[PDB]
């Protein structure tokens, strides 16, 4: 699906 | 914080 990664 | 909106 839509991807948000906050490292 | 960081924002991602997928309408």
Swiss-Prot record, chains A, B:
It is found in: Cytoplasm. It comes from the Eukaryota. Coiled coil: none annotated. Disulfide bonds: none annotated. Heterodimer of two subunits, one of which binds GTP. Interacts with polyadenylate-binding protein PAB1, and TPA1. [PSI+] is the prion form of SUP35. [PSI+] is the result of a conformational change of the cellular SUP35 protein that becomes self-propagating and infectious. This conformational change generates a form of SUP35 that assembles into amyloid fibrils. [PSI+]-aggregates sequester soluble SUP35, resulting in defects in faithful translation termination by read-through of translation termination codons. [PSI+] can be cured by GdnHCl and by deletion of the molecular chaperone HSP104, which is required for [PSI+] propagation. Present with 78900 molecules/cell in log phase SD medium. GTPase component of the eRF1-eRF3-GTP ternary complex, a ternary complex that mediates translation termination in response to the termination codons UAA, UAG and UGA. SUP35/eRF3 mediates SUP45/eRF1 delivery to stop codons: The eRF1-eRF3-GTP complex binds to a stop codon in the ribosomal A-site. GTP hydrolysis by SUP35/eRF3 induces a conformational change that leads to its dissociation, permitting SUP45/eRF1 to accommodate fully in the A-site. Recruited by polyadenylate-binding protein PAB1 to poly(A)-tails of mRNAs. Belongs to the TRAFAC class translation factor GTPase superfamily. Classic translation factor GTPase family. ERF3 subfamily. The prion domain (PrD) is a Gln/Asn (Q/N)-rich domain, which is unstructured in its native, soluble form, and which forms a parallel in-register beta-sheet in its amyloid form. This is Eukaryotic peptide chain release factor GTP-binding subunit. It comes from Saccharomyces cerevisiae (strain ATCC 204508 / S288c). The lineage of its organism: Eukaryota, Fungi, Dikarya, Ascomycota, Saccharomycotina. The gene is SUP35.
